[PDB]
């Protein structure tokens, strides 16, 4: 059986500079004037993934010039020339030396932009969540990079490290930038014994942390 | 053109069987091999089987004996016979066809949707995200709708039908006891919004649900 590992999982990258993925099947392939069985694939944003490389060196037609692979024995790897926006994506090689074939397990390509920090915006639950009984506060911290954040909670003061899930959208096809969604969520009573409700970010664009958050005392 | 598009995905319980089926137009479709392709949560590929233009097929082991592939070259379609379906078989099914030969996959078809659970389809409930009021002051203010506690995926959000495409954040559902819950947030000019309408569309086909909420300010 064959297993193909793909490196490295996430790739950063500046916009003009080379990009390198590595492939590796735990099979050595044969063939050095006989046809090879791997390929390359990029499935963009949303969309369902395309051919870019086959019989390990030649292009579809299509794919930019920029794009070019390369391989020898159990190693390959696809490389571009100088990274457009256009290439954002994951990226996925094929071994198909044998049945049955087998994906690599991708690399996420991720376009390198300036820092930014985040702009959070905290709410309330709605009138209409608390009438049935539920009580969720939302927390959405948009456009930043890098991706890495932390989002603390805090009831009265109270850290609040249970309850609270997480949500992230993948790169912007604008900006480029990370948004994220925190969202804590509690019963209408659970929700009423407290009135202080914080949303606490700290991200590595600033030492001091962003504070955002509401009273139920008010509207 | 060449052209392949899937259909027949939907919910099905542990141990049920599901049909996929694969249209094709623009090419001499008994000319080539075609092939089944799967994606799962992992946004991982996996390469589930194939038939070639001779009319010998091949299978992953994971889906062997229990997935049946097969065409009708009479009508031109490629067909996916699932059955014993497992929790692991969860996933968006494409078809694709050689480039050449048994050489590569193209013309990928969107993909039709397959969910193997014993969750019942429920519709999910949308609320509104306004400001905690706060003067603001500002030039830009965020809007939002909490989708929650629906099944099985997936739900569409647009605001004012797509009139409003850019500030959009729409992130990914997230599962908790068996019942997904998103969010998307909008941010639009101070000038905008309350004195023009701001409403969030969310979709959820699997209920035919196409549910409108307008997002008005918290009276202070």
């Known amino acids: 059986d064959v297993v193909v590992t793909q490196t490295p999982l996430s790739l950063p990258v500046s916009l003009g500079d080379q990009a390198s993925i590595s492939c590796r099947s735990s099979?050595?392939?044969?063939?050095?004037?006989?046809?090879?069985?791997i390929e390359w694939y990029l499935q963009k944003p949303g969309q369902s993934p395309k051919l870019l490389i086959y019989?390990?060196?030649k292009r579809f037609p299509g794919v930019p010039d920029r794009f070019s692979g390369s391989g020898s024995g159990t190693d390959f790897t696809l490389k571009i020339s100088r990274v457009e926006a256009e290439d954002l994506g994951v990226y996925y090689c094929?071994?198909?030396?044998?049945?049955?074939?087998?994906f690599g397990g991708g690399t996420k390509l991720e376009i390198k932009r300036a820092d930014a920090a985040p702009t959070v915006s905290i709410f309330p639950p709605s009138s209409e969540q608390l009438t049935s009984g539920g009580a969720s506060v939302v927390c959405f911290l948009n456009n930043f990079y890098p991706k890495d954040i932390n989002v603390k909670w805090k009831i009265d003061g109270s850290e609040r490290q249970n309850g609270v899930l997480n949500s992230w959208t993948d790169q912007d096809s604008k900006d480029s930038t990370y948004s994220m969604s925190s969202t804590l969520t509690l019963t209408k009573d659970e929700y009423e014994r407290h009135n202080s409700y914080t949303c606490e970010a700290t991200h590595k664009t600033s030492t001091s942390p962003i504070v955002k958050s509401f009273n139920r005392d008010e509207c | 053109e060449v052209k392949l598009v899937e259909s027949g995905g939907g919910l099905v319980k542990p141990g049920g069987s599901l049909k996929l089926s694969c249209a094709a137009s623009?090419?001499?479709?008994?000319?080539?091999?075609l092939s089944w392709v799967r994606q799962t949560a992992d946004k991982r590929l996996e390469w589930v089987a194939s038939?070639?233009?001779?009319?010998?097929?091949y299978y992953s082991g994971s889906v062997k004996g229990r997935f049946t592939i097969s065409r009708d070259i009479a009508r031109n379609i490629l067909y996916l016979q699932m059955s014993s379906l497992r929790s692991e078989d969860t996933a968006m099914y494409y078809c694709?066809?050689?480039?050449?030969?048994?050489?590569?996959?193209?013309?990928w078809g969107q993909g039709t949707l397959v969910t193997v659970s014993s969750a019942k389809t429920t519709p999910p409930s949308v609320y509104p995200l306004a400001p905690g009021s706060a003067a603001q002051t500002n030039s830009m203010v965020t809007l939002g709708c909490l989708v929650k506690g629906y099944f099985p995926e997936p739900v569409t959000v647009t605001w004012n039908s797509g009139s409003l495409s850019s500030g959009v954040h729409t992130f990914p559902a997230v599962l908790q006891s068996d019942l997904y819950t998103l969010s998307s947030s909008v941010t639009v000019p101070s000038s905008t919004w309350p004195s023009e309408t701001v409403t969030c569309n969310v979709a959820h086909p699997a209920s035919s649900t196409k549910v409108d909420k307008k997002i008005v300010p918290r009276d202070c």
């Open positions: 694709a066809r050689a480039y050449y030969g048994y050489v590569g996959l193209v013309h």
């Open positions: 623009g090419f001499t479709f008994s000319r080539y091999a």
């Open positions: 038939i070639v233009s001779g009319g010998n097929t």
């Open positions: 099979e050595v392939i044969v063939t050095r004037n006989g046809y090879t069985p």
């Open positions: 019989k390990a060196y």
């Open positions: 094929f071994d198909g030396s044998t049945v049955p074939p087998k």
